[PDB]
Each structure stands twice: as C-alpha cells, then as structure tokens.
C-alpha cells in the first residue's frame, strides 16, 4: 500500500517540480533579457545620455 502511494505521488510531484523548473528558467531569461535591452537603451539612444545629466544633478542638491 505505501509503495503504491509513494510511486503515484512521486509521478505527480514530478510534474510540479518540472513545471516549477520551467517557470524559474524562463523567468530568468525573462528578467535577464531586461538587462541586455537596457544596456542597449543607454549605450544607444543618445537621448538616453540626456536623461543622464538629469536625474544625477538631482543628487548634489538633496544631500545638502
């Protein structure tokens, strides 16, 4: 009896563990994909060098 249980449940849990692994992976490449599209946003877009001097000069100020 215990063996039947363990084995079935084991087959079931496999699907979850798998499903879980897929999600994780994908959402790795997904949030990581963010990186390479934002390193493309600043390196490119010369209009993302203006939004540079911007937010940053708002540093000196506040602190003081």
């Amino acid at each position: 009896l215990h063996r039947v249980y363990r084995e079935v449940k084991n087959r079931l849990d496999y699907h979850i563990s798998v499903q879980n692994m897929m999600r994780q992976k994908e959402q790795e490449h997904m949030i990581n994909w963010v990186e390479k599209r934002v390193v493309q946003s600043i390196s490119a877009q010369q209009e993302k060098e203006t939004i540079a001097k911007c937010i940053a000069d708002l540093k000196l100020l506040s602190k003081k």
Binding site: L1, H2, V4, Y5, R6, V8, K9, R11, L12, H15, I16, Q19
Partner: protein, 120 residues
C-alpha cells in the same frame, strides 16, 4: 484486524532444548522487530489531495486518470504459503505429546504402586 495467539514468554524460554536456543532467540527478536514495525507502519497510507494536483497540472485528465486508476486498483494480499508449522507442530505431538506423556503416566503409576506396597 488480526488474531494473534497470546504468548507467555517465560514458558517459551522453558521449552527450548539448549542446542536450539539459537533458533528460539532469533524467533523472539523477529517477533519483537515485527511488532515494533507494525506499531509504526500505518494500516493505510495518507490519502492524496487529488483536487490540489488537479489544481496544478498541465497534461489533461492525467489526475482524473490517476485518481480513478488509484482507487479500484486492488493490491493483492500475499498468499500465506508459510504455515508448514501447523504440520511441524502436529508432528512434534506424535512426538512430545503422546509418546512422552504416555510413558510418564505409566511411570507415575508404578511409583504409586510402589508407594502402595510400602504403606503395608
């Protein structure tokens, strides 16, 4: 629920020839082992939260397929092909029982007859 012929152990100690104490020992421990075992091994296993799995799946009626298949799958109970003891018992009654008891009685008789005389 099991039947289990009750057993007083000090008697069991007192019926084994020495050249057989080995056996008897192992027989005792197995019993104890076995007993401990059943104290911990539950009748049936935990159920299986089928709803939950059904709730987190991906292949369609796998769970339905399984819950069905699980239930109304009847696990075989092991054949008791092992009670040759009944036999080895009945044998040692040919032996111990009748033969000894018959001679012991006859000896007790003569002893008694021998006390008879001596009363006169």
């Amino acid at each position: 629920k099991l039947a289990l012929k009750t057993i007083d152990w000090v008697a069991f100690g007192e019926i084994i020839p020495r050249n057989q104490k080995a056996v008897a020992n192992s027989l005792k421990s197995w019993n104890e082992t076995l007993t401990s075992r059943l104290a911990t091994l539950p009748e049936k296993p935990p159920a299986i939260d089928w709803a939950y799995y059904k709730a987190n799946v991906a292949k369609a009626g796998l769970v339905d397929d399984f819950e069905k298949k699980f239930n109304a799958l009847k696990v075989p109970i092991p054949e008791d092909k092992y009670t040759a003891q009944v036999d080895a018992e009945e044998k040692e009654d040919v032996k111990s029982c009748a033969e000894f008891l018959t001679q012991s009685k006859t000896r007790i008789q003569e002893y008694e007859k021998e006390l008879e005389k001596m009363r006169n």
